[PDB]
């Protein structure tokens, strides 16, 4: 997370950390708890070459990454079937936990948005995670969970900005319908935040608008953070996640 602050312990109870087995249970991506038994993340986090179920663990909300870990087993990994190398997109995945989490005030699910929610500019939105604090600058020990309020940029305005200073023709789309844009030169998600939630407060309730996906660097001019638009994937999510 670029800009922003350390999250108070009481905020973002749906934030998760995805771990891969090695010399230590290394954080590779963020995720969000969307159902007591299901984690939402980015496809690039777990695909295209999916690791064994034995090689992965889910860590629920923790204030300090690697301090007081309590790792949870996974029973299933589902990468969106349209995710593939040669196209940035369909960047969404699900992990089914072996057991539903016993939800508390400090650890619970995020509400998924209704299909009609477009999350227009002006909306109060926040992105959280344990990623880099700048380009090639690590979040330092004790690895506190960070948060940052990011402005939403309309898709067509965002796509035009990504065409500035590139070889890519105005003919072909860079920012697609299954994507959402947020962030500026002071506030953005960064490497290590991928898979994590972008949440907006709508009519008193926090809705997950996006999944940290990609960008060109972090907090760079004419390069806002790109997220997978959750509404676009609701029907796919609901083929696995009980409503």
């Amino acid at each position, epitope marked *: 997370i670029v800009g922003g602050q350390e999250a108070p312990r009481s905020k973002w109870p749906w934030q998760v950390s995805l771990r891969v*087995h090695g010399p230590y249970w290394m954080h590779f991506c963020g995720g969000s708890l969307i159902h007591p038994q299901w984690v939402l993340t980015a496809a690039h986090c777990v695909g295209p070459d*999916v690791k*064994d*179920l*034995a090689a992965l663990r889910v860590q629920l909300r923790e204030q300090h990454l690697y301090y007081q870990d309590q790792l949870l087993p996974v*029973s299933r*990994i589902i990468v969106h079937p349209q995710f593939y190398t040669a196209q940035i997109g369909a960047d969404i995945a699900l992990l089914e936990l072996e*057991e539903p989490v016993n939800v508390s005030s400090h650890v619970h699910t995020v509400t998924l948005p209704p299909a009609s929610e477009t999350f227009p500019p002006g909306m109060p939105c926040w992105v959280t995670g344990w990623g880099d604090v700048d380009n090639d600058e690590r979040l330092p020990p004790p690895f506190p969970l960070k948060q940052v309020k990011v402005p939403i940029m309309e898709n067509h305005i965002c796509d035009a900005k990504y065409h500035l200073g590139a070889y890519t023709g105005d003919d072909v789309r860079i920012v697609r319908d299954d994507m959402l844009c947020a962030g500026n030169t002071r506030r953005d998600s960064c490497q290590g935040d991928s898979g994590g939630p972008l949440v907006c407060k709508v009519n008193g309730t926090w809705l997950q608008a996006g999944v940290v996906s990609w960008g060109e660097g972090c907090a760079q001019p004419n390069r806002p953070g790109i997220y997978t638009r959750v509404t676009y994937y609701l029907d796919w999510i609901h083929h696995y996640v009980p409503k």
Partner: antibody
Amino acid sequence: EVQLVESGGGLVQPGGSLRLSCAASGFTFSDYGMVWVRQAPGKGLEWVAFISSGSSTVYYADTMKGRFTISRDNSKNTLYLQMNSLRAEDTAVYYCTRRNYDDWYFDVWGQGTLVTVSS
Amino acid sequence: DIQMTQSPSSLSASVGDRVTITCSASSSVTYMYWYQQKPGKSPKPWIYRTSDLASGVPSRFSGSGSGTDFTLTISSLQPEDFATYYCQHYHSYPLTFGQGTKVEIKR
């Protein structure tokens, strides 16, 4: 001593039903994933089923799905295998085995219980 | 889903011989697990996470491989190694075992 003891095997007619049970001792049973593995006489190990610590997750081999049901009773430290519509090809020793908590290999196995499906 | 093909189905080797058992997964997997089972006995964990030896397993045993190809090696075959060895993946459900390799000792 960490132990698993299977029971309930025996001779059953084709189309019959049988419930196998596996008594666990020496560990906190409710913390572990548990599985059934069978071995036909003179043949290899064949995975049957898996059940998570809290019973929310169950999986089966393709040829036994539907007909076999895995369950557990954590207050009784017991794992069960409900076998219905039994066929000659189900004849095997059925092993109860514990999934290692940290590394997921099957680290404790019972002595096994022989099931013979014949008329 | 993941299918295991183990080879050879049986072998006869001399004490002190280097013995290699192979296991092929139908699709790429992170780890390989191995079990030893003696006649009329129940299986025992032998190797896990491709190369980690279970407790009490002697260091003449080793495991290696990646992707779809894995092996179990005995650097110096011993009389007590007489057994059937099985490979097993833990990639996703359904789980499967390889067909086994029966090891006999020459004399």
